[PDB]
Design a protein around this ligand. Structure first.
Ligand SMILES: [Cl-]
Ligand SMILES: [Cl-]
Ligand code: NA
Ligand code: NA
Lengths: 495, 488
């Protein structure tokens, strides 16, 4: 299968105030198709003046948007939902080109669940209420949940348009304008989202999109004095940088969704076909590039051998290939530099004495040699001090760890600075709830993995995050509380 | 002269291992109140391990068992109100007429409020489909740290520790080095009430040391800070660069008081007085920009002068004293620099503007109650928080103008309006960019009412039901009862 050269797209511009506009930075970058190594597009990088221009546009649009009725805002966000449903397949193809994730994932998950969250928040806008508190017959307090104003979202590359929707949906539903910076690795679908919002009737300026580099555009947003909140999804290290600068510049509210090393606990009474199916879904979806992945799989010592056989069987079914083929369920990694990092982790697994159950190398041959492919990889005989066990790899690398008793596995599951997700496989009522209640993670799955309903707040304990996304609480967290006391009695001064 | 004050770790006073001490002064006399030990890095580690142990005991108790213990501490605080207030007056220089009526009363009010809410702390349940549902738990963060300020030492210790403890956490509290004494008393009271050892530890020290060790510690899950913007930026950075902690910040402001054209000017003047000269002007929420209509400005100025002439500086333990020295001479030096800038920038000095002098005043950092008028928005005294007894009066002409000018600041803590008009009151308040808004009053902060800043004045809130919840972390749990589908 040849004659498959794809030409590059038109140069991608910034989106400010309901239109595409040239950056004033004079700088551009390129986004690559990780399946081919070909340039997808040249993209303009927002400079400091561009960020200033976006903030003033956002301030102007926010005023229009917040003065509307609640239901007028709901109807506009619902119209964007309708367009996203209609354009699901077109957007999924673009996301696949930009990220390397199989169309079988992007057409089923990325836009579907992004729009699910926007649809959820659209319906909740009229239910955003303050409080009233009587103090005495002559005085009472009431509160308003006011927009923060202009907020910024900084996206990650593994779920580009989904992250854009999960950040912008509650921000807009709460009456804010959002300036969104997509990952420089994956800028394309965020620009499509901006056009869709405008087409749905969103006032100009309420969702502006500034592609750029993290050290530049991202920093300018975290530093801007008129941005009230930053929401960041990305790596633990970059999170530390964003959180510091948002403080050291102007005191902003913050949300951070970072990575993890999430444990999957297989109990002694688990069905091992179910356990293996869960472990597969917790490690090899999106080629292992998922923050919540269950990359430390704890198996009772007495079941380890049988569990390894069941994992080997299922790994052998994984279908790498043409990302637009229906039956493909595994893609290359997002970039060649990322593959180099994943390969360094795999080599450290080998050199530290873990047993390679399968994989451990790049894929080779016609069609794979030009993509950033890593074979699905499983290490076993792992110990808690190994680098591959302690550190997030963000590739298709499962670590299997044996354990003897429940107290032990809880200790070892929690013995980490991460705390994003966790799960248990057990048919037993008491074991399921008892174990989960003791795990130090924000997102816990019993006898499943990976579902993230719009209703369910998600985020990390410890170094895996600050704040939450989704759920009613995240609509509220994009407002700020104003307390107002009405004193109807005579005011007494002591002077 | 009090005994040398020790650290409070795990239900007892313990010697610090830093080898370091500092002194706290009586700001009215210059006398040394106490030598105080400073917590070192190992002391902070020890306090954290103590807090981890106590937090486990505390969180395993029933909700009502926790509620009863905090209520016992309230009862003790009510009984010791006057003794604690007198110590607070000695440490801060604030009149006993304030500390015995406000500081402990309202600190204990908030503890009492949260004690009763512990059993109402609930998660959620969300059905997805017949075969699957989600439930959430509001779990303790674990060990949290509070960093207090010197203007309301025990009140701040109570407003931070009450929701933290009620949410099932242990708190390590670092008082201001200027005012460490009542926080140590509070730790003893909590133990006397039955608080498990380790759940409230108190570490006096310096900001450059003890405070930094707390923000850096990997096993502290949240920092709550009250103080100045400068220290706040420093605390915010270290908490991020260390272990990604949740953060709350209660900072200063330059809050506007808007007097409307239909306001009674005796009421307006009384509100402006209370918004500027309580605690000798050392209050973050003070209404230090007083906007008055041009046509009423002269009459308002006269009414302010009449009330300023009533202020009673003197013996801080006398019933009728209602004005104290500033907390320190270095702080007075800064306030005096602001007063000088008002003079040199062309504001009109209506009254005050100098130190108080004479027997009884020369040994304290007293500043006369000071009022500038004819002020403009570009003046330093208008632009910056002074944190002393300095009111700035600003003329305005129309409502749209005064809203713009009130909001034209990066601060955003408080605001207020004086008007008998229904539409004017709500219409103006809804447009102001401040978290704490008072109509026809100033300064009341009910336990039920969330308080904190917009913009550069803060992150997060204190008090209200929401602050109990903000000292928990949400865990979402999905129960999948249907058959799990893998695509592999
Ligand atoms: Cl262990
Ligand atoms: Cl103006
Ligand atoms: Na790309
Ligand atoms: Na003192």
């Amino acid at each position: 299968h040849h004659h498959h050269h794809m030409s590059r797209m038109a140069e991608q511009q910034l989106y400010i105030h309901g239109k595409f506009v040239a950056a004033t930075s004079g700088k551009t970058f390129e986004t690559i198709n990780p399946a081919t190594g070909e340039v997808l597009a040249t993209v303009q990088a927002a400079g400091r003046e561009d960020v200033d221009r976006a903030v003033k546009s956002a301030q102007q649009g926010q005023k229009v948007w917040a003065a509307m009725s609640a239901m007028a805002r709901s109807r506009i966000l619902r119209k964007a939902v309708d367009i996203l449903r209609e354009r699901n397949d077109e957007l999924a193809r673009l996301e696949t080109l930009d990220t390397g994730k199989p169309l079988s994932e992007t057409a089923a998950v990325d836009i579907v669940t992004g729009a699910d969250v926007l649809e959820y928040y659209a319906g909740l806008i009229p239910a955003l209420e303050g409080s009233q508190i009587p103090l005495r017959d002559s005085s009472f307090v009431y509160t308003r949940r006011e927009p923060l104003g202009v907020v910024a979202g900084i996206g990650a590359w593994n779920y580009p348009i989904q992250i854009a929707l999960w950040k912008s949906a509650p921000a807009l539903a709460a009456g804010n304008a959002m300036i969104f910076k997509p990952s420089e690795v994956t800028p394309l679908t965020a620009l499509k989202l901006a056009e869709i919002y405008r087409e749905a009737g969103l006032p100009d300026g309420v969702f502006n999109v500034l592609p750029g580099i993290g050290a530049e555009t991202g920093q300018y947003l975290t530093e801007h004095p008129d941005i009230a909140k930053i929401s960041f999804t990305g790596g633990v290290a970059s999170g530390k940088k964003v959180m510091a600068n948002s403080a050291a510049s102007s005191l902003k509210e913050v949300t951070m969704e970072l990575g993890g090393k999430s444990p999957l606990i297989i109990a002694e009474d688990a069905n091992l076909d179910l356990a293996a199916d869960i472990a597969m879904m917790a490690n090899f979806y999106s080629s292992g590039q998922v923050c919540t992945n269950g990359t430390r799989v704890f198996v009772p010592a007495k079941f380890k051998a049988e569990f390894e056989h069941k994992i080997l069987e299922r790994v052998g079914r994984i279908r790498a290939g043409d990302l637009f083929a229906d039956d493909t369920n595994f893609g290359p990694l997002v970039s060649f530099p990322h593959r180099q990092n994943v390969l360094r982790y795999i080599e450290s697994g080998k050199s530290e004495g873990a047993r390679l159950l399968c994989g451990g190398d790049v894929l080779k041959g016609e069609g794979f040699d030009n993509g950033a492919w890593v074979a699905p990889t499983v290490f076993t005989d792992c110990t808690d001090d190994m680098t591959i066990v302690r550190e997030e790899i963000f590739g298709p690398v499962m670590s299997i760890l044996s354990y003897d008793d429940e107290a032990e596995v809880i200790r070892r599951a929690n013995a980490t600075e991460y705390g994003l997700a966790a799960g248990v496989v057990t048919p037993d009522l008491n074991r399921a709830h008892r174990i989960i209640h003791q795990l130090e993670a924000g997102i816990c799955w019993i006898n499943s993995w990976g579902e993230s309903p719009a209703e369910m707040p998600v985020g990390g304990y410890k170094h895996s995050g600050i704040g939450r996304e989704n759920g009613v609480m995240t609509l509220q967290s994009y407002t700020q509380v104003k307390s107002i006391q009405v004193e109807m009695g005579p005011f007494q001064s002591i002077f």
